[PDB]
Amino acid sequence: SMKCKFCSREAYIKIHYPKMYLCEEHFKEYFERKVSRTIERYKLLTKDERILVAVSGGKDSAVTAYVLKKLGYNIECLHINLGISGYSEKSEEYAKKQCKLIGAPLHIVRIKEILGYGIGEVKTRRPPCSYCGLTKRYIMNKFAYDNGFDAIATGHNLDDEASFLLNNILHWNTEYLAKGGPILPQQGKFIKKVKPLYEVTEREVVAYALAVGLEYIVEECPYAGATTLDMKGVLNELEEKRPGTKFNFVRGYLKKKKLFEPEIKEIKECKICRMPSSGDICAFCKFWGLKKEINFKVSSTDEEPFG
Ligand SMILES: [Zn+2]
Ligand SMILES: [Zn+2]
Numbered sequence: 462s463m464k465c466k467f468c469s470r471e472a473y474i475k476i477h478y479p480k481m482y483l484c485e486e487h488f489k490e491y492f493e494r495k496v497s498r499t500i501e502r503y504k505l506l507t508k509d510e511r512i513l514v515a516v517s518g519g520k521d522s523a524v525t526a527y528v529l530k531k532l533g534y535n536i537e538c539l540h541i542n543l544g545i546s547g548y549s550e551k552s553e554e555y556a557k558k559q560c561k562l563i564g565a566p567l568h569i570v571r572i573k574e575i576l577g578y579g580i581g582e583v584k585t586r587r588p589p590c591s592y593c594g595l596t597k598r599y600i601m602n603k604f605a606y607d608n609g610f611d612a613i614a615t616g617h618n619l620d621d622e623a624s625f626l627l628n629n630i631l632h633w634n635t636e637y638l639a640k641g642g643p644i645l646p647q648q649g650k651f652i653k654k655v656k657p658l659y660e661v662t663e664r665e666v667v668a669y670a671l672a673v674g675l676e677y678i679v680e681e682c683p684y685a686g687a688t689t690l691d692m693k694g695v696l697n698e699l700e701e702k703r704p705g706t707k708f709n710f711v712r713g714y715l716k717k718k719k720l721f722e723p724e725i726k727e728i729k730e731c732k733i734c735r736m737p738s739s740g741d742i743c744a745f746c747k748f749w750g751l752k753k754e755i756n757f758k759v760s761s762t763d764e765e766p767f768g
Pocket of ligand 1: 465466467468469470483484485486487
């Protein structure tokens with residue numbers, strides 16, 4: 462109970478699969494090997510690829526960027542500052558401190574600077590979270606496309622997958638349920654999106670961040686009581702009662718995911734930015750009322766202006 466399975470050092474955490482108590486260093490190894498297997502299993506990345514990590518200042522993206530760097534991947538990071546007064550400044554400061562420790566270049570996009578408004582400052586009854594998700598997802602893909610990155614890696618973990626799944630099944634969001642899993646392959650101007658933490662729990666992510674010295678922000682905004690926090694608690698209660706519930710729900714989902722494909726509405730190029738649009742002008746451009754394209758091509762980072 463008190464000691465590590467592979468050494469005489471004090472146990473740091475208890476790992477359920479396989480059953481084992483691991484010290485700080487054997488946990489780090491376990492974790493990294495788990496991420497490494499997820500990459501190979503779903504053929505997520507190759508070491509020749511230039512990977513962009515979307516870093517929010519939260520633990521999930523911090524850990525994603527940290528483990529990919531440790532594994533030997535070619536990674537660069539992107540932080541999207543949402544311009545939320547009293548939130549966005551510390552979020553950026555957190556993301557900078559993380560990328561300095563990781564030793565990865567950090568690119569910053571300030572929404573307030575390019576668009577004029579922060580998330581929650583736009584005159585709309587539309588909840589800040591919906592248009593924020595739209596904004597982040599667009600900036601991530603366009604920054605990556607504009608700078609010739611081959612793949613985007615996000616920090617979503619098993620708990621995020623299972624919670625997103627439960628919410629969407631409860632609202633029967635079958636379109637969202639067709640576009641799921643650890644990899645959204647590269648299609649047109651959509652850059653390949655990957656989730657290397659897909660098979661690791663939020664608990665394991667928290668323990669990794671603390672053991673390697675990563676400091677992160679819990680809340681990215683003051684606009685997040687949403688369903689996901691309720692779903693995670695639900696799934697945790699079901700997981701402590703029936704161990705293997707979360708894994709099975711996601712494993713089962715990946716096998717049946719096919720059934721939701723006919724629900725997909727059959728994707729042209731935007732007339733403003735030339736990015737994937739369902740209509741004449743894409744949702745991002747239509748929302749922000751843009752008549753001009755945003756060029757995310759960078760010659761260098763702010764912390765390394767001469768490289
Ligand atoms: Zn040990
Ligand atoms: Zn557009």
